[PDB]
Design a binder for this molecule. Structure first.
Ligand SMILES: COC(=O)Nc1ccc2c(c1)NC(=O)C[C@@H](C)CCC[C@H](NC(=O)/C=C/c1cc(Cl)ccc1-n1cnnn1)c1nc-2c[nH]1
Length: 238
């Protein structure tokens, strides 16, 4: 996260850190708890991941230093990538992780509500991007979960900023015209959380941008409301 500040413990209890074990253990991506065995994240996080056996999901983490060999995690039973996904820049950048065991909800780990279809028309004014990603283009994974408040940008304005790309309504953009606050390397897969009527909603999934926090280059997020039926298809299968 560029231009953000330290989160307080329990502030974003749906935020997870997804680690890979191959070749060595490191933070791979962010994710959000959406159900007691479900993590919503970005499809591009699994580039080159040949098996769910190398993945570890840690919930209830503020600091990466809380993670040692003796720290409990959730194993991943299955990786579900949207089958229209080709690359982050073309959209469908969405994946579900089905966990091997159930998350016990509490004040340190709980789900974020998905947006309602009836709320496609609501204007969100209180949106935050979170993660342990870089604070600048060449940096390192941050110990403390960072947060940054960022305004949503219309599809028309985002398309103007990304000449040469096709910004679809399945994407949602966020950023200041002058830049300064954004997601960066290591934040992808994490949430873009917006508070509406005292309820937090998972509005976006951190996906891509041209550099980080650049003037007139908003962050591009998967527009979660456009995938609610796909999430229900995969999580509510009979
Ligand atoms: C010690 O541990 C570490 O250092 N871990 C460690 C360290 C770094 C990374 C990873 C692990 N993850 C990967 O490389 C997985 C691999 C498939 C994922 C590729 C892509 C991923 N992109 C982002 O996270 C965000 C992009 C992004 C999104 C928005 Cl909305 C705006 C600007 C963005 N940027 C444009 N340019 N940079 N950012 C990424 N993540 C990293 C580099 N790049």
């Amino acid at each position: 996260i560029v231009g953000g500040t330290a989160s307080v413990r329990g502030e974003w209890p749906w935020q997870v850190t997804l680690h890979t074990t191959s070749p060595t253990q490191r933070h791979l991506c962010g994710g959000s708890i959406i159900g007691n065995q479900w993590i919503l994240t970005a499809a591009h996080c699994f580039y080159g991941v040949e098996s769910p056996k190398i993945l570890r999901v840690y919930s209830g983490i503020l600091n990466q230093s809380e993670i040692k060999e003796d720290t409990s995690f959730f194993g991943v039973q299955e990786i579900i990538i949207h089958d229209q996904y080709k690359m982050a820049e073309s959209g469908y950048d969405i994946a579900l992780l089905k966990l091997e065991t159930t998350v016990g909800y509490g004040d340190s780990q709980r789900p974020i509500c998905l947006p309602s279809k009836g709320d496609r028309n609501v204007i969100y004014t209180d949106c935050w991007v979170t993660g342990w990603g870089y604070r600048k283009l060449r940096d390192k994974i941050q110990n403390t979960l960072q947060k940054a408040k960022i305004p949503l940008v219309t599809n028309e304005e985002c398309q103007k900023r990304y000449r040469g790309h096709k910004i679809t309504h399945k994407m949602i953009c966020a950023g200041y015209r002058e830049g300064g606050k954004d997601a960066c390397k290591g934040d992808s897969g994490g949430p873009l959380s917006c508070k509406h009527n005292e309820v937090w909603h998972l509005v976006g999934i951190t996906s891509w941008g041209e550099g980080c926090a650049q003037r007139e280059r908003p962050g591009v997020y998967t527009n979660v409301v456009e995938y609610v039926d796909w999430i229900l298809e995969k999580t509510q299968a009979v």
